[PDB]
C-alpha cells in the first residue's frame, strides 16, 4: 500500500502520519521504509520511531521486538538509555493495562511477568545510565514496582495463610524478605510468618519474629 | 603505484568507508597491478557489487562498480496451498531476502532449492522461475513462479520378510494411504517419509505387542516411479517370532514400594511378550513413584531374551530418587485474573512430597474451571537440590462473559429492549455474574445473579439471585392476565468431593395477578388452590406469597469448563415449598451432560444430554401452571419454536374480559371464536423427559489455532413434556398429555462460534415428529 | 489514533510509579540478621535525571535524515551529525550555502574566511509532539580533506518563543 | 477443483502419421491385465513360436505365435497365505532358458516353469523382489533386487550361490540394473549412479566406477525411466547412469572412453555405431560410439510415454503408454509407419525376436505386430 | 464446625524414623545432606538449623504432625536433633 519514494520522503511521510497521530499509518510507512531502504542511515531512527509508535498504538509486543532489534543492531549507542527505558516501559504496560483499574479493581494479584522483566530493564537503565534523562523516572518505577511485586507475593502468602499451608507461608514471607526488607507488604508479611510459626508449634521462632516486629513497630 | 585517492563509484547498499575497508588498495596503500585484480575480486567478495572495474588515473584509483542489491521485494505466484513464507524460508536459508544483495548467478541454486522443497513436500512435479524487476538505484523485486505440476501419490506398500501377517492388514494400521475408497475416505493418498517413519514404528509395535521380542526391520526403500508420482514401498523386515514373556526381573531403588511394583508387574509366564505392556508398566511404576514423591524415578526395562525356547525375562532397573521435591509453585498467563483463584484449585501444595496425582488433579480442577483456555505446566527442577523443584502452571487464560438480547417490535410502538450480560469471573475477581432484564411495553423485568464460588477457603459458593418481573400482559394493564412476579433466590454451593457438590437455599416469590385468562390449566390450578375462577370471564385476580426451599447436587468429572470433550456431569436441582407459602408443592429436576470421545484424540465426541423433572403438590395442593415444563426454540431444544412443546392451554367460552378490542386477541371469547377454544399455547407440563444426541465434529476450514474453541455437531434430538394431571375425560375433545407418548423429534447440525461474547450456537434442525399445536422453525439462532 | 484529547508526549494510564509511596525499610533488632539482600534489586539511589511521568518525553530520540549523500545522521548533545565523504576540502561549504538558502535561513554571521556560520532562530514543529519549537544553529564545516565533517549545532532551542534551557 | 489446480505439462503429440509400410497387428490375443498402472519390470519374451506372456497378479501363458493361441496356461498365484490365492504379483521380466521360464516376484520368489506345460520346475525365495529381469546363463540366475542385492542362483533349483551389496541409492530409485555377461564378468549399472564389473563366476567385484548423480541432495528426474542395464560391446561398455547420463567405458577397467553426462536419457540400444535412444524428454536420437555425436533426432513424440527402441524389419520401433506404435527411418530419421494398436498403453519391452514383434500393454497386454 | 466433608491438607518435608537413624549429632550438614538433602526451611538469621516438619489434616479429625528440626552450629555441625511429634 506504501508508494516507493526516497527514504527521506517516506520517512517524512511517516512523520506526517505521526503528525496526524495515526500511529497505524505512521508505522505502516516506517515499516515500509525499512523494507524499501533497510540500509538507510536512519533505519535506526525508524526503529526508534516504531518503538514510540508501537507504544502509542498499544503494539507492545512489536515495540519489544523493535527494541530487541535496536539492541542487536546497535549494541552501543547514545540513544540506548531511551531504548532501555522503553523496554521497561513496554514490558510494564504489557504486564498491566486492563481497564479494570477504572473500577478500582487491583492488578497486583496478577503475576508481574513483564513487570519483572521491566524491573530488570529499568534496573539496567539506572545502573548503566546512572543519570540519563530517563533515569529518575525509571528509578521511581523500580521502587513502586518492587512494592507491586511484594503485593503479589504478599497476596500469595495470604492465600497459603488462608489455606493453612504454614510452611509455605513462612517460606513465602521469607522469600519477600530475601528479595527485599522494605515494602509495607513486607512489614505486613512479617506477622503472617509469626502466625504460621505458632500454627506449627514453633512459638520460639514466632517470638523471634515478634521481636523483629517490635523493632519495626512503626 | 600507490593509490592517490579512490573514486568510490558503485555504492548504494555499501558505504564509502565500507568499500574502502573492503578494498586491498585503500587510500594511501601501495597498489600493484595484482592488487588491482585483488581489489576487483575483493569488491566482488562483498556480495554487493554486480560488476567491479578497478582502474586508475596514473595512480589515482577509480572503480566503476555496478551494485547488485538491494532486494526491495519478493513475489510469490503459483505457490497454491504452500505458504509463501515457507518458500521464503529456503530463500532466506540461501542468504536471500529483502535488504540483501541479489546475486543472480545463484538463482539456479535457489530454484533448485525450491524444487527440492517440493520434492520434500511429497510433490516434485513442479518447477520454478525467478523473475527480476529493477527498482530505483539498484533494487530488485524477486518474483517467483511456482509451476506446481502435481503431487505424488501413494500407490502400493510392499512388505517382504513377513511371515504371519497380511501386508494389507498392516497397511490398515498405517498413516500412509495406498488406497482410499469413496465410501471410506479416511485420508488422502499422499506420500510423506514422516508418515513412513511412523508406520515403520507402527509396524514395529504391531509385532512388539504380539510376542515378537525379536521383531525388527531390516531396511526400506521407497519406490521412485518414473513419473514423479508412483509411490510404492519396499519394506524389508525380520519377523523374529513370537517370544513369550516368562518373567520380570525388576530391581534397583524400588523405594520400599517394590510390593506395589510387583503388583504392577503381575504378568503371566508364557504370555506373549508385549513390549507396549512393558512400556506401560515402566510408566506405571514412574507414576506410582510420582505419587510417592518421586519426581525423577528412572525406570529401564530389559528383555532378557531366551532364544533357546523363545521366552523373555524382562529385567527392570529402577532409580526412584528423592521424595520431597515440591518447593514452590508458580502460575503463568494469569494476567487477567487473581492468582489465588488458581492456587485454590491445586491439590498439590508447597513444602511437600511430590504428589504427581495431586498435580494432575489440580490441573483437572483448573481444566474444569472454565476461565482459562488451556491447561499446562512446568515442573522446573531447581538447580542445586533434589529437594527443590518449582512448578510453573503456565496456562492460557480465557475471555469470559457474554452479552445478548432480543428486540422487536418497537419504533412506532412503546420503546422496548432486552438486557443480559454475563461476566463469569468479573474482571478476574472470582465472581460469577449473569445479570439481565428487559423493558417492554408489555412487561419490564430485572434479574440479578452473582456468585462468590469461594466466599471462604472451603468453596463457599455464595450465590444470590434477585428478580422483578413487572409483568402485566400490558395491552391495557390487566384483563389479559396480569402477573407481576418478583422475589429472592439465594443458595449456597457446598464442597462435597472432588467431583461432588451440593446446593441449598431459600426462595421468595411474590406474585400479583389480575384479571386472568379463561382457561383450563389456569383455572384448574386455581381450583386446586381452593379458588373459584370464572370460565367465561377474566375478572379474577390472585396475589400470592410463597416461601420455598431450593436444593441440588452436582457431579462434575468433565474436561474443560467451557467446551469439554471427555467425561460427564450430573446436575440435580429441585425444590420444595416450606410452611409460610400459600401452596405446598415441589418441583425436582435433573440434567445430564455426558461426553464420550469417539475419536481417541477427541476430534469426534459422543454427546448425551438429557433433562428430567417432575412437580406436583405435597398433599391436596399442586405445582402452579406457570412453573410448568417448557421446550423448543432455545435452551436445549431446537427445530421446534420457543416453548411450543408441552401441553396446550384450553380456553373456555369467554364473554367478558374487562377489555377486549373489537375482534382481536380471541381467547375463546365473545368476539368470534366462541366455546371451549383450545389454543396453541403450550402452557407446559408437570413432567419432563428429553434427550439430545449430539456429535462433535471438526471444522476443516478454520485454522486449528482457534478452531479448537469452535464446535460443530451433528444431532438427533427428541423429547417430551406432559401433564400427568391432564384429566382426559375433561379433555375428552382434546389431546391427552397425561400420556408420556408425546415425544417430539428433530435433527441436523449445531454451530458453536466462540465470539468476543463467548460461544454462540446456531443450528439447523428438521422437526420431523410434530404433534398438534406444535410450531416449528428449522433455522434457529442461539447464544 | 482514537484517544481522549492529546497523548503525543506522555505515558499511557496514570503515573502510578511516581504516585506510589517510598518503602518502610525494616530495622531488625540486634542479632536478627537475615539474608534480605538475596534478591536482584540492584537499585542505585541518586538524583539523575530528567523529568518524570508525562513531563518525561517518550519521544523517539533525535536522528536527522540523509539530507546530503553519505551523511553521518545522528543527533547527539545538541548537534545533528551529517558528516560527508566527497573528494575536496571545500565542497560542503558551498553546498551548505546552497542548502541554507534552499531552507531560507536567516544568518547572523558568515565565516566566509573559514567554512562556518551563525544563524538566528527559525521556527519548526511537528504534530507528533504536544509542542512547537524554534532553533538557533551554529554550522561548522570541517575540511578534513576529501571528507568534511558537518556540525549542525543547536545553539538554542526556543519553544515557539520560549527559549528552552 | 484440484483437476484445474494441477499444472500438468502437455506432451508433443504425433506429427506425420505413416503407413509407408502400412502397419497392423498380426493378432491382438491380449489375455488381460497384466501391468495396469502398477509400474513393473515384468515384460514378455518370445521364442520358438511360444509367446512367453504373463500377467502380474496370476496367469502365465504360452501362446502360439501363429495366431495367439493358448498353448498352455498356469498361474503363479499361490493358493493360500495371508489372504486367498496370494496373487503372482511378479516383479521381474520374463526370462527363458533351457526348459525353464524364469520370473522374479514381488514376494521375492524366483520361479522356473516348464516351457512345455508350465509346471513349477522350481521356485525359490531370494533376498527381496527384483527391479530387474533375471539373467540366466552358465548355471546361474543373475538377479538385481530393489534392496540393491546381486544374487546368483542355481538355474536348476534356485540354490543361492551368493548375495552381494550393490550401488544402493537413497531409496528405491526405479530402473533395471540387470547384470549382463561378458568374458566371465557380470556387468551392471547402479541406481545411485555407479557402474561395475563383477566376476560373474563368483560374485567377485572386478571394478566399480562412478558415472553420474542420483536422487538425494542432487535430486534428479523422478519422472525419468532410464535403463541401468548395460550394453557391452566388445571391450567397451555402453550404458546409462541411473540419471540417464550416457557413458562408454573400458569393460575391464571402468575407464571412461567418453560420455554424454548431460541429460537423463531414458531408453537406449547400441546399433553398432548408432545408439538409438529415447531422451529425458522422450526425444528420439541416434548417437555415434566414439563420442555421443548426434546422427539424427526427432522431437515429434516429445514427452510421449515411449517404450524402449528396438529394430524390426529395418525400422526403429517404439511404442508408448498411450497405445501408439511407431516406425522410424533408422537413418534420418522420421516416420515410416505408425499404428495405434490400442489405448491400453505400453511400458514393457517390445520383443523384436523370433522373427516377430511381441509387445505387452497394461490391460490389452499381448499384441503381435506386423506391417 | 459440624461438618463431615473436608479436603485433606497434607505437606511433606519430613524425615522418617529410618531417616532419623541415618544421622546423629556431630554430623555436618553435608553428612546429613548425603542422603537427607535439605529441608525446605532454615533459621532466617540464627544458625544452620534444618527444619523437616510433617503436617497433614484428616477430614476434621484433628491434624497429624511430626516436627523435626536439626540444629547445626556455625560450622555446620549438628548439635541437636529435635524430633518433635504432634502438638
Numbering used by the authors:
A (entry chain D): 26 to 243
B (entry chain A): 24 to 806
C (entry chain C): 25 to 189
D (entry chain B): 22 to 392
E (entry chain E): 24 to 110
Quote what the paper states about this structure.
Folding and insertion of OMPs into the outer membrane is mediated in Escherichia coli by the β-barrel assembly machinery (BAM) complex, via a mechanism that remains unresolved. The E. coli BAM complex has a molecular mass of ∼203 kDa and consists of five proteins (BamA–E). Its core component is the Omp85-family member BamA, which contains a carboxy-terminal, membrane-embedded, 16-stranded β-barrel domain and five polypeptide transport-associated (POTRA) domains at its amino terminus, which project into the periplasm. The other four subunits (BamB–E) are accessory lipoproteins ranging from 12 to 41 kDa in mass and attached to the membrane by N-terminal lipid anchors.
Here we present the cryo-EM structure of the intact BAM complex solubilized in n-dodecyl-β-D-maltopyranoside (DDM) at 4.9 Å resolution, which captures the intact complex in a ‘lateral open' conformation for the first time. The cryo-EM map contains density for an unambiguous single copy each of BamA, B, D and E, as well as the N-terminal ‘lasso' of BamC. Most notably, the β-barrel of BamA is in a ‘lateral open' conformation despite the presence of BamB in marked contrast with previous crystallographic data, which suggested an incompatibility of BamB binding with a lateral open conformation. Although the conformation of the BamA β-barrel in the cryo-EM structure obtained here is similar to previous ‘lateral open' structures obtained by crystallography, the five POTRA domains have undergone a large conformational rearrangement relative to the lateral open structure. The simultaneous presence of BamB and a wide POTRA 2–3 angle in the ‘lateral open' EM structure demonstrates that conformational gating of the BamA barrel is not dependent on the presence or absence of BamB. The conformation of BamA in the EM structure is thus a hybrid between previous ‘lateral open' and ‘lateral closed' states. Interestingly, this micelle surrounds the β-barrel of BamA, encapsulating all of the hydrophobic residues that anchor the β-barrel in the lipid bilayer. Additional contacts are observed between regions of BamA outside the β-barrel and the micelle, along with additional bridges of density from BamB, BamD and BamE. The structures of BamD and BamE are generally similar to previously published structures, with the exception that BamD appears to have flexed about a hinge in the middle of the molecule. The C-terminal globular domain is entirely absent from the EM density map, suggesting even greater mobility for this region of BamC.
